Design a protein around this ligand. Structure first.
Ligand SMILES: *C/C=C1/C(=C/C2=NC(=C\c3[nH]c(/C=C4\NC(=O)C(C=C)=C4C)c(C)c3CCC(=O)O)/C(CCC(=O)O)=C2C)NC(=O)[C@H]1C
Length: 481
């Protein structure tokens, strides 16, 4: 893809985090084929002397005693000499991958998790605005994880993102309202996070534990750790966290109607391990947030649609109550503009344009019509940045940053064209987005930026986006004209 940031194969880095152990077994005899270099931590023996051995001769008696439920369920609690561990199974590269990580220590964890689930599934939760929904999600995730800072991060259209809501302990700094470059979470990371919706970095300073051997022998490349809970993350990102002053990180993908909408990101100033089952409990909260957002967004759409139908009905009542069509539209200007949330409208009903509200002058409208008549757009054309595709009005963002035009005839140049002014947006970037990384000379290593301090810019010449209800209202108004 675009940048070198996009090319690092983060699922093939060949390392795991030091708090866990990984063992990959092959074939009917379950012969050990890949093992983490720290595996004496739970095997009692030097791991390289166990490659090739069958599983019953490798694993502790305690784990073997749980093999049946492990195989059947893919996840069991095992009590080892080192303490309680969560054992996890998944498949990768034709191997059965066993991961062990420290298990949840609080017996009441799930009871606590059900309580915070209540806050987010409540009778009419999200009734103070979706902002209160986002805040509740940040608060409950922080309560359940104990992380110092929890942020709701939304991806915008160009895949840069912004923090919409933040929950943090007293005294902490935060990132509320700040924007971050798309390269902060590159394309292959976004792809992985769409398929694997949870990731924990327990200690941003710890060194990775390598796998032995360093390739899957049948493949000649490292074991695919795409679905591994212990996967050590990109070194560049660990440097990013260090530059942020973050010692531990945990994030959850927000998947809303199938697409990666954002993340809930958690930061801790010191190392912090969250158990597998506590992370899965937090995943319920994030799934609930996504459901609540969808329910409220669709509710808003349905309400907006009803308002547009009502406007069309009120205009039909106004019509035929006397006067020509032109007289009615002039008198009902406010309703005609509200159909599409516009500031002005031009009607070309056969002669010169009828200009209602704030529009460009007659000359500029007539020139725009002659251009629209050449364009390919079936029945409706819309843009929120007219100046990029129609230079004659590019300096006129005071009245025509956005347009929504509908055809009123097959071949003839008869249109209704609604206009919108620009909405300037002053945004704070977390660091200078003109320097989103610090590459070494030669451009072969790359480091993250050193500074996340606010850097201000104002986005101009773009209107509010045209909503689905705006487009439907315009289609429905065509029949009246
Ligand atoms: C040239 C490449 C760069 C780069 C690579 C990179 N970042 C990755 C993971 C990642 N980044 C973020 C970003 C944020 N964390 C926050 O708190 C905020 C806003 C407040 C942002 C924008 C996150 C959340 C993550 C996921 C991991 C986590 O900590 O939760 C990855 C993938 C790491 C992996 O192996 O999974 C890569 C490759 N970051 C850059 O800045 C440039 C230099």
């Amino acid at each position: 893809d675009l940048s070198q940031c996009d090319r690092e194969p983060i699922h093939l880095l060949g390392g795991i985090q030091s708090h866990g152990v990984l063992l990959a077994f092959r074939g009917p005899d379950r012969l050990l084929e890949v093992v983490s270099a720290n595996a004496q931590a739970l095997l009692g023996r030097p791991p390289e002397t166990l490659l090739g051995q069958p599983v019953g001769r490798v694993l502790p008696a305690e784990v073997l005693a749980q093999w049946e439920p492990l195989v059947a369920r893919g996840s069991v609690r095992v009590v080892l000499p080192a303490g309680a561990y969560r054992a996890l199974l998944h498949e990768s590269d034709g191997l059965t991958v066993l991961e062990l990580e420290p298990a949840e220590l609080q017996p009441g964890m799930e009871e606590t998790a059900l309580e915070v689930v209540r806050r987010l599934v409540s009778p009419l939760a999200g009734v103070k605005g979706t902002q209160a929904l986002l805040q509740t999600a940040a608060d409950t995730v922080r309560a359940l994880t104990g992380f110092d800072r929890v942020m709701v991060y939304r991806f915008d259209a160009d895949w840069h993102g912004e923090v919409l809501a933040e929950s943090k302990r007293g005294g902490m700094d935060g990132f509320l309202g700040m924007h971050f470059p798309a390269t902060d979470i590159p394309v292959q990371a976004r792809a992985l996070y769409t398929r694997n919706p949870l990731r924990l970095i327990a200690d941003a300073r710890a060194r990775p534990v390598p796998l032995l051997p360093p390739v899957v022998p049948a493949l000649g490349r490292p074991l695919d750790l795409s679905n591994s809970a212990l996967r050590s993350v990109s070194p560049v990102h660990l440097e990013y966290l260090r530059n942020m002053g973050v010692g531990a990180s945990f994030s959850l993908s927000l998947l809303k109607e199938g697409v990666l909408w954002g993340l809930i990101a958690c930061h801790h100033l010191e190392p912090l391990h969250i158990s597998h089952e506590r992370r899965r409990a937090c995943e319920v909260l994030t799934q609930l947030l996504a459901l609540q957002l969808s329910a409220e967004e669709r509710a808003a759409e349905a309400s907006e649609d009803a308002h547009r139908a009502a406007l069309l009905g009120q205009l039909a009542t106004a019509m035929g109550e006397g006067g020509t069509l032109e007289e009615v539209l002039e008198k009902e200007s406010e309703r005609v503009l509200a159909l599409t949330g516009a500031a002005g409208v031009a009607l070309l009903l056969g002669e010169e344009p009828l200009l209602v509200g704030c529009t460009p002058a007659q000359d500029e409208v007539e020139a725009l019509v002659a251009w629209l008549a050449t364009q390919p757009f079936q029945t409706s054309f819309h843009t929120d940045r007219l100046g990029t595709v129609y230079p004659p009005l590019a300096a006129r963002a005071d009245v025509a940053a956005g347009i929504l035009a509908v055809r009123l005839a097959p071949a003839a140049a008869r249109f209704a064209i609604w206009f919108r002014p620009e909405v300037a947006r002053t945004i704070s970037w977390a660091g200078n987005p003109r320097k989103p990384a610090e590459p070494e000379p030669g451009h072969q290593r790359l480091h993250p930026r050193g500074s996340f301090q606010a850097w201000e810019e104002t986005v101009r010449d773009t209107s509010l986006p045209w909503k689905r209800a705006d487009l439907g209202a315009a289609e429905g108004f065509r029949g009246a004209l």
